[PDB]
Motif scaffolding. Structure first.
Motif, short mmCIF file in Angstrom:
data_model
loop_
_atom_site.label_atom_id
_atom_site.label_comp_id
_atom_site.label_asym_id
_atom_site.label_seq_id
_atom_site.Cartn_x
_atom_site.Cartn_y
_atom_site.Cartn_z
N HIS A 1 109.66 -80.22 7.10
CA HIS A 1 109.75 -81.59 7.57
C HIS A 1 110.29 -81.62 9.02
O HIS A 1 109.75 -82.35 9.85
N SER A 2 111.30 -80.81 9.33
CA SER A 2 111.84 -80.78 10.69
C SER A 2 110.77 -80.38 11.72
O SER A 2 110.68 -81.00 12.78
N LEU A 3 109.94 -79.39 11.40
CA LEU A 3 108.88 -78.96 12.30
C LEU A 3 107.86 -80.08 12.50
O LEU A 3 107.43 -80.31 13.62
N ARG A 4 107.55 -80.82 11.43
CA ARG A 4 106.61 -81.94 11.49
C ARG A 4 107.17 -83.03 12.42
O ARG A 4 106.47 -83.52 13.30
N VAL A 5 108.45 -83.39 12.23
CA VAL A 5 109.08 -84.40 13.09
C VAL A 5 109.11 -83.91 14.53
O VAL A 5 108.80 -84.66 15.46
N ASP B 1 107.30 -67.46 8.50
CA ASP B 1 105.97 -67.29 7.89
C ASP B 1 105.54 -68.50 7.10
O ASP B 1 104.38 -68.91 7.18
N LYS B 2 106.47 -69.11 6.36
CA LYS B 2 106.19 -70.31 5.57
C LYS B 2 105.86 -71.49 6.49
O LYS B 2 104.97 -72.27 6.19
N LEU B 3 106.58 -71.63 7.61
CA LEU B 3 106.36 -72.71 8.57
C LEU B 3 104.98 -72.56 9.21
O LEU B 3 104.27 -73.56 9.33
N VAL B 4 104.61 -71.35 9.65
CA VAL B 4 103.31 -71.14 10.29
C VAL B 4 102.17 -71.35 9.28
O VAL B 4 101.22 -72.09 9.57
N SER B 5 102.29 -70.74 8.10
CA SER B 5 101.24 -70.82 7.09
C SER B 5 101.03 -72.19 6.51
O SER B 5 99.94 -72.48 6.06
N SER B 6 102.07 -73.04 6.52
CA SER B 6 101.92 -74.40 5.99
C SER B 6 101.69 -75.46 7.08
O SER B 6 101.57 -76.65 6.76
N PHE B 7 101.63 -75.04 8.36
CA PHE B 7 101.50 -75.98 9.47
C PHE B 7 100.17 -76.69 9.44
O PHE B 7 99.09 -76.07 9.47
#
Length: 165
Positions: free
Chosen positions: A134-138, A158-164
């Motif tokens: 959520h923080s990366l999305r905001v 890895d989770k942040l990049v793969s779910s972006f």
């Protein structure tokens, strides 16, 4: 200059890196600290950045608080970057572990727009208790200036990049 980042958008970049090590290598104009309203840099990113300054960040911060009082959640102040950067932008994201309004995360990221380029952590992530996805999305939906995100944890990176999206 910034190297090894993955480009997420026109202006948002991400890297699995220790932000202290990134700051010592890059010496950016601005490093963002994941601050609290008291500028008490005890743990998380703040504790690590402060320890890298040999506590000079905390001494400067205590003088700032003595003069100005606490920051607002969602607010920021510009102080010295010490040996890490020209400036440190201390930004207060909401701490979910203190029941603070997650809606203030967008206000916190808006502070980044006052700087053309920044090295930063994900606000309200880690010990602040918010969902880093959520923080990366905001971040991507709020910051318009060039932000180089350092994510300490490889598994989270890895989770942040793969779910972006």
């Amino acid at each position: 200059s910034f190297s090894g980042y993955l480009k997420l958008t026109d202006n948002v970049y991400i890297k699995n890196a220790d932000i202290v090590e990134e700051a010592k290598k890059v010496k950016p104009t601005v490093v963002v600290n994941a601050a609290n309203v008291y500028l008490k840099h005890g743990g998380g990113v703040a504790g690590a950045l402060n320890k890298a300054t040999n506590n000079a960040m905390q001494v400067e911060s205590d003088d700032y608080i003595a003069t100005n009082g606490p920051l607002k959640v969602g607010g920021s102040c510009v102080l010295s970057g010490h040996n890490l950067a020209k400036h440190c932008l201390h930004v207060v994201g909401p701490n979910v572990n203190k029941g603070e309004d997650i809606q203030l995360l967008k206000s916190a990221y808006e502070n980044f727009n006052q700087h053309e380029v920044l090295l930063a952590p994900l606000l309200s992530a880690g010990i602040f208790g918010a969902d880093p996805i959520h923080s990366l999305r905001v971040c991507v939906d709020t910051v318009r200036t060039n932000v180089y995100l350092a994510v300490f944890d490889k598994n989270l990176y890895d989770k942040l990049v793969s779910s972006f999206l």
